[PDB]
Amino acid sequence: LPTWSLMRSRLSLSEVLDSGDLMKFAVDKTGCQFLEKAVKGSLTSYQKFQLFEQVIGRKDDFLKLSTNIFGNYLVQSVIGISLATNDDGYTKRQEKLKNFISSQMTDMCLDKFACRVIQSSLQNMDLSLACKLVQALPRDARLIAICVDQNANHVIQKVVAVIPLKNWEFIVDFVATPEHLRQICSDKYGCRVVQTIIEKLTADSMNVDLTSAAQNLRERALQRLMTSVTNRCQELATNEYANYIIQHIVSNDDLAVYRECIIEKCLMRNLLSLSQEKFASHVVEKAFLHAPLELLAEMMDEIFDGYIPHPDTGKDALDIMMFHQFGNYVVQCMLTICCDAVSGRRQTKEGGYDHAISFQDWLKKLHSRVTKERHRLSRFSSGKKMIETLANLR
């Protein structure tokens, strides 16, 4: 801090602006604190002119402040003041701001503090100029590093949230690339990007405001990404992060058409194996909970009769899953579903059939097995829950 301002004083904002020492105030813990409160008062036309010039008018100072732990707050304040100042410099300032950020898009996205200037600009700038910010995103392997970056991943999620799909449709096709999808979906942060994109591409209640032409664009982009996801749902469903994406698709009612595809492509004929996986067992749970009835019948038949019992012990698939540290949650799901059906909490009509007689069949199977194994089951918390679930039915 300059000595003419000394520790602290009764400083005026015009003093700071006229001194030429704003930069050493904006990077200071106490100085930037004074500026954040000063710019919230009634500024004169010239004081705003000075802030525009000194905070978002010089590229190098704008970059330095945007990447500063404290100065990035001042930049967002001044950007907001500039957007709220409808004078004759309004067009010139927003254009200069877009060019500043676009020229350093990638590095600002990867910066812990500058990525907040990006997100603030994306949601507050006029929609037209914010769209030009998306055009500055990279199209090579730096986009992968952005999607999997601890900071830059929120920039992509912000783009998806506040910018029309026409401007970021290339990200959908970039992520849908099979090689890119593997890296991104298997990342702690890249999996959030992919799930946020899917949610924005879903025709749910948050998208009824779209025009028909925008719905068609949304539908086509969704089909291209769902094709890529379902082409590889086996490695995604077992992955420690990508299993959340497969769960979301299987459990979302507005994505019901992709339920049959996912359940049939990677879940069917693998239920015993996937139910014993730490991550895939959650996907199996969701698949039982939301499967169409005709497909649910096939999943039930696979557990009850899809496997040959062990040739030495006679242990079958239900026995293995029932007492497995992960499979027991799947069997519990099967039992809760059947009890919900026979008691009325779940409807049983589909495709002209009433599957109530089928739910009664599967419940009879699980009740019969829980009865025989009541002593082994009573050792476990999961087993006591299955016994209690059945007793609550009567």
Binding site: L272, S273, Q276, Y307, I308, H324, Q325, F326
Partner: peptide, 15 residues
């Protein structure tokens, strides 16, 4: 990954 080994069973044939 301190889990018990998977217990796999032979699948019934599909048609």
């Amino acid at each position: 990954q301190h889990e018990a080994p998977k217990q796999l069973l032979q699948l019934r044939s599909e048609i």
